[PDB]
């Protein structure tokens, strides 16, 4: 069931935003780990004297990495005068967001086609209000309310090369970088109590429940029009024996935030040689692999879709297979970017569901906690 | 001319630990783009419920990025009862330091023959005390008085594997990298007068002026008895045409830091051969290059030290030549470390001096800055 019920017109995702502490250190890591290309910059050597931002793009994925400076720098500013290219961007909110919760998302940002007519729309039907539409160079219109946590929902429109003020990078300094990501498929967030914050979301988005098919979580999916924006929500289940993920997330992230962000890729098995390549010089590390009972019950589960090399193929790399009844789903799951147990990357790929794929097609893997447990032990024996 | 009036016995440099926001991704930018070995780590792996400690080594250099946690993790420790491996370590302080310097060096440790007594001989003689002598396990000593800004000098004594407290790295995620680094020669500061930091530091270590052989910089050399232990420091040259480099770095750090740290390779073109592989895929940048009339004007002041084909190496990657009167010293800097104009890493080699190799030999580079000037209008022609 789809009742298409979005308030105002959504594209697709747009970018992510990370704050952090040191954004060419983060940025450069995040580079050679995921194969993203350096695009643009907006920072003192473009005359932004307020904040350093750098993008990386692979294909449609945008991961932009935000820094203040000294707020010495433009003390002299106005808002009226900023030097800034982002102006949402405030000095003391990123100390203390970045503070507060170290490394992480701060804002999710999705394409719409009237970013002012999206904000007021969205304010009217109860979204708490973070910075007002702006007008960039009068070509792009920016504006932001919560989601959760201390994460924004940002909205972006374009009249008719980033953002006005980022200039394109240079490419000498520009390597392309590619291991096969492609797109933003989903973003997870993790809140104290599911209820409350789906009625909110969705109450001012209009977003529809996605609808899916004891190991610590509840959760839900709220879909856009066309489902291609994904937004799961996940809450802790308490007093179970093994303590729950969502509730050690909450504790080092001093509350609410963004849990994991899920990239598709146009060839999991290539993006995780890729990946796997660089875990141990700079890049990222992934979960512990599934013991090889996991990898004898997928003949049974999905044997009419990967072939037996392609099953000995995932056995090699970690991946796990999901089914849903319209398509299939291979995901595999980094340890977390940062310091803290909090946020973490998923790398994708979907098979079926062909009309163009149809998004959230295989659902979101929910099935593999049960197998993983079984699997494991099976394999205790 | 060599007083050897240290006044306390004083080894070797020990070690260099920079704070940030979060360690692990500065960690891992740095071991790419350096070749540095991840040795020993202090996190919550380790019970470490206070700061995230990551020690990267090559050769005998030893750089340790350090993070912290959420305060609440520790809500219920005391001094007593810490669960941290760096009893000097403060939350407070650590994210002070970083909102107001960004990313740079905290701590510039070098080994003594007693901690508490230089401690204590120090501090009798001027130092401002910092973190008291503190005896870790029975087996190591550790005590912190300020050098400049907010950088301390750390004393590090030893009875008798980094720290306790400190797990070495499961060598599965310990990669063995290795571009050719080696120790750490010399480490920088940049202060605003020379002459009152010159004398509070040589006032309690004893350290004698090492002596040398318009450009923006005043500077002075610090050494210890052998003078293995080098701590050179500039001050701003005001009025100037060209402005200070030294005046933008306190501008820019808000006030008094580390400048740059030297790193004594063992074979500089192959260390700068693979720098330069990795500089735009997750590693390092280098300054730009100097014109071939710098490396046309080589061959008369130092062919009798290097080839013809050393020079043109010299010309392909972009290393600096300098020479005093006991031995040569090539020399090159990358682009700073972080987003701000600030801390910024020199790899150096020495040639001469020979007894074992005394410490110094060649200088440091200071007629390069004329020399480039030169070259630099030669070739403008
Ligand atoms: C330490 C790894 C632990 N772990 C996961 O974290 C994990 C995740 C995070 C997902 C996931 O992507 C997801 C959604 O996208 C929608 C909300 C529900 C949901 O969980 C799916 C399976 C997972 N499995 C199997 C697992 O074992
Ligand atoms: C943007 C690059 C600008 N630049 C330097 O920064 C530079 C430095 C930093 C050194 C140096 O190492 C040093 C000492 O170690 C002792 C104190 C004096 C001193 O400066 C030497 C030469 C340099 N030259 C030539 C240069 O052009
Ligand atoms: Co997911
Ligand atoms: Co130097």
């Known amino acids: 069931k789809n009742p298409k ?25 995040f580079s050679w780990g995921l194969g993203m290309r350096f695009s643009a910059k907006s920072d003192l050597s473009t005359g932004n004297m307020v904040h ?13 990495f935000t820094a203040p400076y000294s707020p010495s720098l433009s003390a002299g500013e106005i808002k009226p005068t900023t030097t800034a290219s ?44 973070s910075s007002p539409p702006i007008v960039l160079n009068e070509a792009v219109t920016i504006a932001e309310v919560k989601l959760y946590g201390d ?12 953002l006005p003020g980022f200039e394109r990078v240079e490419d000498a300094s520009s390597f392309p970088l590619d291991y096969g990501i492609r797109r933003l498929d989903h973003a997870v967030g993790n809140v104290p109590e599911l209820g409350p914050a789906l009625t909110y979301v969705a109450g001012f988005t209009g977003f ?29 289940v308490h007093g179970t024996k093994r303590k729950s993920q969502i509730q050690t997330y909450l504790e080092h992230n001093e509350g609410a935030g963004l849990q994991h962000l899920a990239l598709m890729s146009e060839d999991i098995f290539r993006t995780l040689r890729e990946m796997r390549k660089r875990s141990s010089i700079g890049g990222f590390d992934f979960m512990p692999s599934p013991p090889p009972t996991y990898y004898q019950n997928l003949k049974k589960r999905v044997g009419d879709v990967l072939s037996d090399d392609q099953i000995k193929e995932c056995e090699e790399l970690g991946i796990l297979v999901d089914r849903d009844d319209q ?22 790929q979907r098979v079926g569901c062909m009309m163009y794929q149809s998004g959230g097609c295989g659902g979101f893997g929910k099935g593999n906690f049960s197998e993983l447990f079984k699997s494991i032990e099976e394999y205790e024996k």
């Open 208 to 236: 529809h429940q996605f609808a899916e098919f004891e190991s610590g979580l509840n959760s839900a999916v709220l879909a856009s029009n066309d489902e291609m924006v994904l937004l799961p929500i996940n809450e802790p």
């Open 151 to 162: 994460v924004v929902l940002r909205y972006v429109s374009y009249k008719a090369e980033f």
């Open 86 to 129: 982002i102006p949402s961007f405030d000095h003391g909110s990123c100390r203390s967001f970045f503070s507060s919760h170290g490394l992480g998302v701060r804002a999710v940002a999705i394409e719409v086609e009237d970013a002012e007519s999206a904000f007021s729309i969205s304010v009217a039907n109860g979204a708490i209000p």
């Open 52 to 64: 350093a931002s750098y993008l990386l793009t692979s294909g449609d994925l945008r991961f932009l």
């Open 5 to 29: 019920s979005d308030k105002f017109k959504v594209k697709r995702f747009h970018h992510i935003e990370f704050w952090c502490g040191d954004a060419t250190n983060v940025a450069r890591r």
């Open 327 to 348: 398509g299939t789903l291979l995901q595999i799951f980094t340890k977390p970017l940062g310091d803290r147990p909090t946020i973490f990357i998923e790398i994708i």
